Every structure is written in structure tokens, then in C-alpha cells.
């Protein structure tokens, strides 16, 4: 089963190489979708897969990131079911 779902990342989060790591991350999960940083001095985007690697890729998300983030929050919505992947790679919005 692939589900979509979309998340945004608070903390010490800009300025610490967060989009790459999470491109690079998504990729050695199997994932596909984008990253993007916001205004607000959040990251933020959409994560598509297979149900287990997408969970894999949450913790990651909610855990870890890039060596010197600090994560204070992600918040994760929107989960849905998908009949096939709306993006071939993972992206860096820039």
C-alpha cells in the first residue's frame, strides 16, 4: 500500500543542511516527493511510499534529521492512500 502524507519540521531546522539530508534520506528509503524550507523557519513537504518505508522516514523526521538540527516538532497530515506516485525523485524546492 502507498500512502502520501505531508509534514513540517520545527526546531533549529534552517541553516543546518536540512534539505539535503532529508533528500539523501528519502532516497536511501525508497521515498519519493519534496522538501522545502518556509518562511517561517520551518522545512516542510510531502513524503510517498510504501507504507513501512514512509514510517521509517517519520521517526527520521521526528528523531533525527541533519547532524546539528534540533527538532522541537513535526507534525504530519493529510496521510491518504495513493493508486500510484505522483513524483518520480525526491526533490529540493529551492
Same mark, same amino acid.
Given at each position: 500500500t502507498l500512502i502520501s502524507v505531508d509534514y513540517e519540521i520545527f526546531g533549529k !531546522?534552517?541553516? !543546518?543542511?536540512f534539505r539535503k539530508h532529508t533528500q539523501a534520506e528519502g532516497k536511501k528509503l525508497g521515498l519519493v516527493g519534496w522538501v522545502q524550507n518556509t518562511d517561517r523557519g520551518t522545512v516542510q513537504g510531502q513524503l510517498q511510499g510504501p507504507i513501512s518505508k514512509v514510517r521509517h522516514m517519520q521517526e527520521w523526521l521526528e528523531?533525527?534529521?541533519?547532524?546539528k538540527s534540533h527538532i522541537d516538532k513535526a507534525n504530519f497530515n493529510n496521510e491518504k492512500v495513493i493508486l500510484?506516485?505522483?513524483?518520480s525523485d525526491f526533490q529540493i524546492v529551492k
Open positions: !531546522v534552517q541553516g !543546518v543542511f528523531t533525527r534529521g541533519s547532524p500510484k506516485l505522483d513524483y
